[PDB]
Amino acid sequence: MKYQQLENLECGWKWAYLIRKHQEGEPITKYIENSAAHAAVDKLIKLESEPVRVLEWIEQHMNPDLFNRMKQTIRARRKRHFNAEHQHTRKKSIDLDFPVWHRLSALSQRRGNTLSETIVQLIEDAERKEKYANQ
Amino acid sequence: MKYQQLENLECGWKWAYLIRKHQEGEPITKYIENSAAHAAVDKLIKLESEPVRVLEWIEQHMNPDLFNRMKQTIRARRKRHFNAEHQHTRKKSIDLDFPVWHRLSALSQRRGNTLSETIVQLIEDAERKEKYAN
Amino acid sequence: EMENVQKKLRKLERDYYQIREQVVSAKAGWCAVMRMVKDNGVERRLHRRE
Amino acid sequence: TIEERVKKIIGEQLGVKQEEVTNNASFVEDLGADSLDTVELVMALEEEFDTEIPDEEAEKITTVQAAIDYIN
Amino acid sequence: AIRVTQSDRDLFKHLITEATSYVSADYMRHANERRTHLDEALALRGELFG
DNA sequence: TGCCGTTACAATGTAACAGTGG
DNA sequence: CCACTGTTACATTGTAACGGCA
Numbered sequence: 301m302k303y304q305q306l307e308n309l310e311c312g313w314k315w316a317y318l319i320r321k322h323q324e325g326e327p328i329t330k331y332i333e334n335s336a337a338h339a340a341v342d343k344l345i346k347l348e349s350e351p352v353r354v355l356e357w358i359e360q361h362m363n364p365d366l367f368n369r370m371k372q373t374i375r376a377r378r379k380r381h382f383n384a385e386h387q388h389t390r391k392k393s394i395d396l397d398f399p400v401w402h403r404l405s406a407l408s409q410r411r412g413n414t415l416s417e418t419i420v421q422l423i424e425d426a427e428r429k430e431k432y433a434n435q
Numbered sequence: 436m437k438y439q440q441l442e443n444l445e446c447g448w449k450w451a452y453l454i455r456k457h458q459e460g461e462p463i464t465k466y467i468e469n470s471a472a473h474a475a476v477d478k479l480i481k482l483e484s485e486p487v488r489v490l491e492w493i494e495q496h497m498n499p500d501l502f503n504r505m506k507q508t509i510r511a512r513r514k515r516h517f518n519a520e521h522q523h524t525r526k527k528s529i530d531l532d533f534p535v536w537h538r539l540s541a542l543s544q545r546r547g548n549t550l551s552e553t554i555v556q557l558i559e560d561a562e563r564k565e566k567y568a569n
Numbered sequence: 570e571m572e573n574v575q576k577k578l579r580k581l582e583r584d585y586y587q588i589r590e591q592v593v594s595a596k597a598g599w600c601a602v603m604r605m606v607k608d609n610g611v612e613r614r615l616h617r618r619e
Numbered sequence: 620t621i622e623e624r625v626k627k628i629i630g631e632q633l634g635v636k637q638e639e640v641t642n643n644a645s646f647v648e649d650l651g652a653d654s655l656d657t658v659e660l661v662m663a664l665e666e667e668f669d670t671e672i673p674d675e676e677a678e679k680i681t682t683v684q685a686a687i688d689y690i691n
Numbered sequence: 692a693i694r695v696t697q698s699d700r701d702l703f704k705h706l707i708t709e710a711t712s713y714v715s716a717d718y719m720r721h722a723n724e725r726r727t728h729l730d731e732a733l734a735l736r737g738e739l740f741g
Numbered sequence: 742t743g744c745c746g747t748t749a750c751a752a753t754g755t756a757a758c759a760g761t762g763g
Numbered sequence: 764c765c766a767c768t769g770t771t772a773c774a775t776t777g778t779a780a781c782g783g784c785a
């Protein structure tokens with residue numbers, strides 16, 4: 301375990317995720333009957349200020365589909381929350397044109413390294429050229 | 436004008452955008468009184484499936500300050516919609532670690548190029564170095 | 570050899586720049602907070618040295 | 620400009636008013652910045668202009684006027 | 692009157708204590724790490740200058 | 742100007758892989 | 764083995780800022 305797990309924060313995250321999914325129209329409940337699903341959703345809504353019971357609501361009415369997406373989303377949210385503290389640990393999102401991305405990805409799988417590592421090697425070669433021009 | 440604009444599509448986009456914003460708590464309407472805002476929002480909700488009247492609804496009840504954001508969101512939606520048809524026109528999104536991004540952007544502002552142009556030039560130089568050696 | 574060492578020097582320079590910027594930003598945010606807590610909620614209530 | 624970026628750095632690194640930070644305003648007595656506060660001020664001045672200063676020549680700087688004098 | 696005053700006192704006590712606990716701890720945490728980062732940066736700076 | 746394309750981001754969600762420990 | 768965690772590489776949508784153009 302590298303990231304501290306906080307219960308009262310991850311529980312709130314989970315509740316918000318469930319509410320977002322439902323309001324998006326998805327069937328968070330495991331119930332096919334409309335009435336039981338509605339009752340479970342209403343109770344979940346009441347659980348707004350009690351994130352602790354959200355775990356129990358999960359164990360009682362959460363759709364079996366969502367375990368993987370849940371554990372993925374909350375894991376990623378935890379990682380991002382802990383990384384956002386410092387800039388040097390932050391991430392920057394950029395968009396690339398298809399030809400450029402195609403060439404870059406081909407180069408990276410050729411070198412067997414991540415995109416950031418490939419960019420590091422490339423920019424380092426350019427900066428090495430600049431340095432040798434300078435010395 | 437590069438992309439032709441389609442009403443039954445862009446109007447649905449606008450309706451969905453406004454509904455999303457309202458669900459997010461944004462004040463869609465210009466009415467400070469909660470009753471008029473709620474009435475207008477209900478009209479909008481029941482206004483689904485209507486371009487020619489959602490446009491009028493916007494003209495009549497729309498919040499003044501969201502016009503630009505909605506306009507640019509629709510611009511981006513249109514451009515993405517037209518570009519997502521072909522592979523060469525699509526765009527690939529990636530995440531770069533902050534130091535790497537800082538250095539790459541340093542190069543891009545220094546040279547006046549965009550990220551795509553800067554990376555293309557750098558890769559081309561790397562390829563040229565390979566060919567020099569090879 | 571000296572140029573080789575200077576490359577490591579530049580690496581260390583970048584590291585130090587990273588740390589200096591991090592600390593500078595932390596101080597800037599902290600000063601903003603202090604200016605925002607002129608309401609006297611900071612002297613002991615916020616600053617529980619315990 | 621440099622002569623107002625210096626004030627921007629000093630005020631937002633010490634939290635003092637822009638009006639307070641004049642050319643002759645000494646950091647320790649006028650602005651109240653102590654050892655670490657002054658260290659952070661010099662570090663921020665370094666960061667602003669992406670330059671470096673010697674330790675002794677930096678510590679010699681103990682006023683807004685001296686700060687600008689070394690910067691410009 | 693007794694009921695109302697008791698409720699008010701309890702609410703005030705709880706709110707104040709919990710708000711202080713919630714805020715001051717993060718404040719101290721940040722202060723501590725800023726101190727630590729400064730300490731580290733000085734060593735980096737000295738080594739760099741040499 | 743007012744629209745319109747365009748870029749460079751931000752925020753969140755996912756799939757997939759790699760690690761880690763019991 | 765097995766589960767849970769950390770990480771990367773995207774996608775998806777929104778936004779602000781430029782710059783072109785009538």
Ligand SMILES: *P(=O)(O)OCC(C)(C)[C@@H](O)C(=O)NCCC(=O)NCCS
Pocket residue numbers: 653654655658674733734737738
């Ligand atoms: P403030 O009273 O806390 O004083 C801080 C300090 C001036 C002692 C500190 O900022 C500092 O300068 N430390 C390093 C001193 C030095 O010259 N060391 C040599 C390089 S490690």
